[PDB]
């Protein structure tokens, strides 16, 4: 009874869609729209609630970066505003550790953040923690073994192959081995002891390559590439498989959803989104 939710995104303008995909039967459900359109946001889940964090509304009337945190309850199909972050964060990355949401990086106009802040749902409060060693927008974030990783991105001048890890009990960030490819706008997730980085943009092309970091060995290794090159894709893990959703391939706003099986090292097309889009926020929780 778990669905893949996709929130927001962009196609002509930033979007307010909330749609949920059921891998068990291939269906899509359109649910309550976000109150404000946004692309470049991130999604996450804590205690059965879905959260939409940051992003920017790129509308016909202008660009507004978002510091918003909005809460969706599948039991009522209703969005509720939660406490806003200290600063707007477009092209943010988020990770959940021990019931708390970490918001990492992102931009506010020409400001590229290294700052990081943590949300406690029990108090509806954000607090700043140690900043990253590098400013990162279009950064991929994932959590493995209660450690937070920030991968790739763009620092205001260069696209990055670097990555770093936050150790919460020391409130400290440390660099990890850099990836073998420069990636800004990649999808980053965790699956079976590894941090995966899929797609993104290297400065010249949108990528179909995928590499994974084994935290025990400190190495990055390429796996099978996706069928579609994509940047600003959504990504999540569900029942031991990675799912990538949409993105931009330099020509089209993809509706493709591919699924990676780690046992066979293969990607397959599993469904199409209802319309092509980039910059979505994705997470997995109960059916509404």
């Amino acid at each position: 009874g778990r669905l893949i939710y996709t929130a927001g995104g962009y196609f002509r303008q930033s979007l307010s869609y909330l749609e949920a995909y059921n891998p068990s039967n291939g269906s899509w459900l359109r649910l309550a729209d976000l109150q404000v359109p946004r692309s470049g946001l991130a999604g996450c889940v804590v205690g059965g609630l879905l959260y939409a964090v940051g992003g920017r509304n790129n509308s016909p009337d202008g660009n507004t970066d978002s510091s918003a945190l909005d809460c969706y309850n599948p039991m009522t199909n209703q969005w509720s505003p939660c406490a806003s972050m200290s600063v707007p964060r477009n092209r943010i990355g988020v990770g959940v550790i021990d019931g708390h949401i970490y918001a990492v990086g992102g931009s506010h106009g020409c400001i590229h953040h290294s700052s990081v802040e943590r949300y406690e749902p029990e108090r509806d409060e954000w607090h700043l923690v140690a900043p990253m060693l590098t400013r990162r927008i279009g950064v991929g974030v994932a959590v493995l073994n209660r450690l937070l990783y920030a991968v790739g991105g763009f620092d205001g001048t260069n696209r990055l192959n670097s990555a770093e890890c936050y150790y919460p009990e020391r409130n400290e960030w440390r660099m990890i081995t850099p990836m073998n490819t420069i990636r800004s706008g990649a999808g980053v997730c965790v699956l079976h002891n590894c941090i995966y980085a899929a797609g993104g943009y290297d400065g010249q092309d949108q990528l179909n390559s995928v590499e994974r970091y084994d935290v025990e060995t400190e190495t990055w290794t390429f796996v099978a590439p996706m069928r579609h090159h994509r940047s600003a894709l959504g990504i999540t893990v569900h029942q031991g498989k990675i799912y990538v959703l949409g993105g931009y391939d330099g020509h089209t706003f993809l509706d493709s959803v591919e699924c990676y099986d780690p046992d066979s090292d293969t990607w397959s097309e599993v469904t199409r989104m209802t319309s092509g889009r980039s910059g979505v926020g994705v997470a997995v929780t109960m059916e509404p």
Partner: peptide, 9 residues
Amino acid sequence: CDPETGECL
């Protein structure tokens, strides 16, 4: 357009 996202500008 932004080559990373496809968005206008």
